[PDB]
Design a protein around this ligand. Structure first.
Ligand code: JJE
Ligand code: FMN
Ligand code: ORO
Length: 363
């Protein structure tokens, strides 16, 4: 462990989180990151490179959606050491989200509960923000640092599929991949038969296919950790039938695992961090098997170490993301996870990340 890792985790982060409300802490982090005011970041080795979704990824550790909802801090996030950045969720029209407070810390559980409710600057604002750096991003992507854009829907929209279609049209041309986020716990009706998922995704794929080739992103579906076995079967079937490019597994949980200690455990919202970790890993495992290992998965939920990352990779993830760990460990967590993952890959006889993807299924 580095000097910075210990100082951030043992002293700086607990101190700052003790002085700030949770949403203020989030907002300041976005500001600092946007300005590049960051501790020095670990040099990515060849072992960490992954080729998937039509792109090179210099390392397999990404920032999950929700940290940079409005695409304000993309360059700072690459500076932090992330191999890829996902922004959003972005809704078609601007919207405020839920009333404050809407983010809650559970430090005794290394967890967070949020009910932001898709607060979003909206597609137009985000479009113009990404256009301002569109060629810089093209070079970053060529250098193995791709960009994902996560699409949401407005609270009052009467046609969910049209909201996602609008997102594809507006931000698709600026993204390496898009995410159809049908799994927020904090918008009424979002997570809801099989035929309607098929309908929605058919429309999204048609819109994507209508973009010019150099502006044509991969399309992924991000799913909840709270799905029934039937839901998971159905999703796998639809994904294969339509040629969806990948899955993001998982969003936050509306469950409250036995054992949570935080005083705020019974707040409404999605739970993230350590209590979500294994529920998410197991969802990756099931989705990989249901798709015969032929559908790339981005694994997310409770990653704070190289071991956590490798467990998701071995379960079937090609790439991982984190968010909640950053709230407790700060920016040095990114180098920590990468260093630990490289060490474990070597210790377990893997030539690189690619060799470990889905390795548990071959035992
Ligand atoms: C879930 C909302 N949330 C929270 C509170 O739960 N904290 N938090 C968060 C909070 C963060 O720091 C808060 C305390 C801040 F900015 F005031 F220092 C950070 C973070 O990485 N900060 C940071 C940075 F951007 C750049 C340099 C140095 C630091 Cl310490 C990253 C985070 F993700 C965050 O996003
Ligand atoms: C405060 C907060 C906001 C989030 N916002 C979004 C979002 O807008 N869209 C989305 O798909 N996921 C969102 N997520 C979920 C994360 O992307 C991720 O799936 C989940 O938090 C699990 O990862 P973690 O345990 O590493 O945080 C959010 C999570 C948190 C904590
Ligand atoms: O904006 C939110 O409330 C939100 C969206 C989402 O997809 N996941 C989450 O945990 N929160």
């Amino acid at each position: 462990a580095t000097g910075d890792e210990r100082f951030y985790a043992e002293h700086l982060m607990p101190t700052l989180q003790g002085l700030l409300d949770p949403e203020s802490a989030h907002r300041l982090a976005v500001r600092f990151t946007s300005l590049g005011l960051l501790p020095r970041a670990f040099q990515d080795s060849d072992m960490l490179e992954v080729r998937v979704l039509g792109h090179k990824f210099r390392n397999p550790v990404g920032i999950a959606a929700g940290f940079d909802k409005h695409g304000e801090a993309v360059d700072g996030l690459y500076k932090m050491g992330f191999g890829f950045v996902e922004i959003g969720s972005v809704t078609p029209k601007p919207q405020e989200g839920n009333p404050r407070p809407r983010v809650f810390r559970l430090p005794e559980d290394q967890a967070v509960i949020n009910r932001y409710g898709f607060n979003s600057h909206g597609l137009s604002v985000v479009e113009h923000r990404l256009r301002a750096r569109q060629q810089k991003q093209a070079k970053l992507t060529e250098d193995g640092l791709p960009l994902g854009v996560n699409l949401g829907k407005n609270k009052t929209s009467v046609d969910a599929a049209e909201d996602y279609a609008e997102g594809v049209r507006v931000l698709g041309p600026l993204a390496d991949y898009l995410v159809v986020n049908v799994s927020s716990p904090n918008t009424a009706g979002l997570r809801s038969g099989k035929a309607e998922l098929r309908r929605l995704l058919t429309k999204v794929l048609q819109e994507r296919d209508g973009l010019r080739r150099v502006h044509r992103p991969a399309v992924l579906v991000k799913i909840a950790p709270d799905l029934t076995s039937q839901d998971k079967e159905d999703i796998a079937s639809v994904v294969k039938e339509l040629g969806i490019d990948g899955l993001i597994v998982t969003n936050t949980t509306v469950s409250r695992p036995a054992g949570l200690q935080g005083a705020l455990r019974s707040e409404t919202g999605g739970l993230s961090g350590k209590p979500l970790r294994d529920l998410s890993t197991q969802t990756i495992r099931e989705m990989y098997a249901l798709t015969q290992g032929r559908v790339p998965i981005i694994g997310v939920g409770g990653v704070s170490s190289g071991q956590d990352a490798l467990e998701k990779i071995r379960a079937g993830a090609s790439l991982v993301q984190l968010y909640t760990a950053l709230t407790f460990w700060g920016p040095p967590v990114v180098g920590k996870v990468k260093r630990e993952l490289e060490a474990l890959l070597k210790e377990q006889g893997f030539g690189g990340v690619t060799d470990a993807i889905g390795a548990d299924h071959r035992r």
